[PDB]
Amino acid sequence: TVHDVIIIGSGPAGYTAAIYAARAQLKPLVFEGTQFGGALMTTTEVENYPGFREGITGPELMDQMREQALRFGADLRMEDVDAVQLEGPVKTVVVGDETHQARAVILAMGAAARHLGVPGEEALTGMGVSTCATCDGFFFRDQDIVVVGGGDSAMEEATFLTRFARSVTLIHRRDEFRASKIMLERARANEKITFLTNTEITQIEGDPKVTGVRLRDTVTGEESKLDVTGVFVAIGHDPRSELVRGQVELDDEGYVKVQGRTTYTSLDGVFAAGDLVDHTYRQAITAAGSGCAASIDAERWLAEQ
Amino acid sequence: TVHDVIIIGSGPAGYTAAIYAARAQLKPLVFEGTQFGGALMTTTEVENYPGFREGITGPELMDQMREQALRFGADLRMEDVDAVQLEGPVKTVVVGDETHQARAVILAMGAAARHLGVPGEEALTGMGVSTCATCDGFFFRDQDIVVVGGGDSAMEEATFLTRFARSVTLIHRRDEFRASKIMLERARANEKITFLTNTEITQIEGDPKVTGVRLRDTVTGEESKLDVTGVFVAIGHDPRSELVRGQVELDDEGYVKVQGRTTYTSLDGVFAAGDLVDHTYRQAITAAGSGCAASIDAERWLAEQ
Ligand SMILES: Cc1cc2nc3c(=O)[nH]c(=O)nc-3n(C[C@H](O)[C@H](O)[C@H](O)COP(=O)(O)OP(=O)(O)OC[C@H]3O[C@@H](n4cnc5c(N)ncnc54)[C@H](O)[C@@H]3O)c2cc1C
Ligand SMILES: Cc1cc2nc3c(=O)[nH]c(=O)nc-3n(C[C@H](O)[C@H](O)[C@H](O)COP(=O)(O)OP(=O)(O)OC[C@H]3O[C@@H](n4cnc5c(N)ncnc54)[C@H](O)[C@@H]3O)c2cc1C
Ligand SMILES: NC(=O)c1ccc[n+]([C@@H]2O[C@H](COP(=O)([O-])OP(=O)(O)OC[C@H]3O[C@@H](n4cnc5c(N)ncnc54)[C@H](OP(=O)(O)O)[C@@H]3O)[C@@H](O)[C@H]2O)c1
Ligand SMILES: NC(=O)c1ccc[n+]([C@@H]2O[C@H](COP(=O)([O-])OP(=O)(O)OC[C@H]3O[C@@H](n4cnc5c(N)ncnc54)[C@H](OP(=O)(O)O)[C@@H]3O)[C@@H](O)[C@H]2O)c1
Ligand SMILES: [Mg+2]
Ligand SMILES: [Mg+2]
């Protein structure tokens, strides 16, 4: 049995691709992962996804998406794809000891936000720990917060956040920055930003919400505690392109490359959407838009066969 | 008073730009038009916009969008922009006899689907007359329908629709087609498609929903009536770029050109989103995604000033 299309991933890109493909009668087979529902499944309030005047929680929105895909006939499997063979007229995915095949594959595996890996970080996500100033910065008006990282994201997140926060402490594990000179100098000029270089977070403290961070000097080992009510982690993203490395062309940071303003990858019959591709906007609504585009691309390509 | 950003248009692109810009504290000034709310304000059920497992009407979705923009502080004006001056550090829009200025402008004026201009067409939109097989084709399962046009859209719409319809009659006002040979030959090979060349629709009949079309031979003037329950108009789209012609670079069909996979136009400080730009996908979710992108582009550009 060779399916018309297999979708790998269950964030906004994968579910929007599934909705369009199912409504187009392609009977999409979707591998959601065991950690299904994408990045919003791990946040609380989502307020910038257009269509909800009062907002909606991340899990509520993703369940709507999932049930919508189901309603039109998508075959959803809460299983991880462990390996793929994407070259040729029949593509194969391997799920544990099971194999599935399709004429077209839509890659929607997303990108992981890099984690500090310290106690308190996961428990307090959506409770004062955030990965996205555009998403949650609104909620820290007149508060003292930290931003972690030494690249352009950290500089952009920190400077953006000062329109809300009382103060921003930018914490970086060395005394040299990966950020561009422009971004670094913008943060230095900002009166609400204080730098702590050669500093790492070892623990995030929080009653039910963030109350402070434990700090450590990366040179001397000196430790101390900082009272803050928000922590923005901006230490980069890792596109989940491991499955397709060596098959689909990637950029130097591992994002899947696509042709022009389409979702076509370097491989015939293989399309890519969402934060697996986009390292610029990284929002639910942009990922959803690209998932729709991938399914329209796939349907048109399938019609050409 | 010079605003940070003015948004022109109130479809999914303009309202999503407004939500992001307002939540970013840019106090966006949005000119919605007197025919506000974009193309969905004129349809009935919207089922492929991700986030609504049971669907939502077009006006319901657009009102959510509008109230969402309002909630975060967008200044919405139900007025048409009649002229713009987009070059330079301060851009001006003229609304009747009033002028408004901004450092950045987001163009979200959309594209108009071309109309037949015949009695019954407007009254029966959402009631059997459609402009979008991807959107509404689902609803005509086992019905006899028509598609109007002689280009690639008409050929694509007609061939796509045969997975639902009992039959598709493709009506074209001449005996020569603008469609590519591939698209024309795909439609000719399709057993469910019948062509009527040198034929135009003069009236769409419909009790509350489409019941038939009145036809006229464009050579002989012979008229007759065809019993059908759906009419898909696929005679092209006109991007609403008239305001900006001669200021922003356009392609040969009048769509606003943008740089790479961004929303930057040829003019500094001017960004463009939605179906004003995209002549490929033309969905609410893709327009919303690009409106978000335009506001992130604009915010980053403004920060650089
Ligand atoms: C804490 C947090 C809060 C956020 N808040 C907002 C917000 O408020 N508004 C907004 O617009 N954006 C927000 N975002 C960003 C938004 O969630 C992402 O940009 C969006 O989800 C990207 O969607 P995507 O489909 O490309 O990838 P993802 O959301 O990453 O989804 C990918 C899914 O596919 C699964 N998958 C990956 N590989 C496989 C595989 N081999 N096999 C099977 N399944 C696989 C993954 O486990 C995951 O579930 C937030 C992100 C985070 C981390
Ligand atoms: C009948 C119909 C049914 C559809 N059904 C679906 C569906 O079910 N699912 C889906 O995904 N897509 C659907 N679509 C397509 C979808 O609606 C469009 O792709 C989407 O709305 C494009 O949004 P946009 O913001 O770029 O432009 P538009 O929707 O065209 O919005 C532009 C708005 O800006 C206003 N405007 C324009 N110029 C000015 C000006 N100078 N000054 C002030 N205001 C101005 C316009 O009047 C308009 O209100 C449908 C379209 C139609 C016509
Ligand atoms: N110009 C813009 O508008 C803009 C905005 C955002 C991103 N970008 C671009 O996107 C790309 C990636 O940018 P990025 O900032 O997200 O990632 P990045 O350039 O790779 O920098 C990541 C930062 O996080 C630090 N880091 C990584 N893991 C850490 C850990 N466990 N603990 C503490 N610190 C850690 C790194 O420190 P080390 O230096 O020690 O490794 C580094 O400073 C860049 O090319 C950037 O220019 C541009
Ligand atoms: N390959 C694809 O997947 C695909 C899909 C869609 C679109 N496209 C491309 O998009 C571009 C536009 O395509 P399009 O088909 O939307 O528009 P188009 O190429 O301009 O063709 C429009 C058709 O509608 C007819 N028409 C216009 N007004 C009419 C009226 N009032 N009454 C009756 N007929 C009318 C025209 O007839 P006349 O010939 O007499 O003018 C013409 O045949 C093209 O470049 C196309 O290749 C490609
Ligand atoms: Mg996840
Ligand atoms: Mg309209």
UniProtKB/TrEMBL annotation, chains A, B:
Signal peptide: none annotated. The keyword Kinase does not apply. It is an enzyme of class 1 (oxidoreductase). Its EC number is 1.8.1.9. Keywords: Disulfide bond, FAD, Flavoprotein, NADP, Oxidoreductase, Redox-active center. Binds 1 FAD per subunit. GO terms for molecular function: thioredoxin-disulfide reductase (NADPH) activity. It comes from the Bacteria. Its cofactor is FAD. Pfam families: Pyr_redox_2 (PF07992). GO terms for cellular component: cytoplasm. It catalyses: [thioredoxin]-dithiol + NADP(+) = [thioredoxin]-disulfide + NADPH + H(+). The keyword Transport does not apply. Residues 3-291 form the FAD/NAD(P)-binding domain. GO terms for biological process: removal of superoxide radicals. PROSITE patterns: PYRIDINE_REDOX_2. Homodimer. NCBIfam families: TRX_reduct (TIGR01292). Belongs to the class-II pyridine nucleotide-disulfide oxidoreductase family. This is Thioredoxin reductase. It comes from Mycolicibacterium smegmatis (strain ATCC 700084 / mc(2)155) (Mycobacterium smegmatis). The lineage of its organism: Bacteria, Bacillati, Actinomycetota, Actinomycetes, Mycobacteriales.
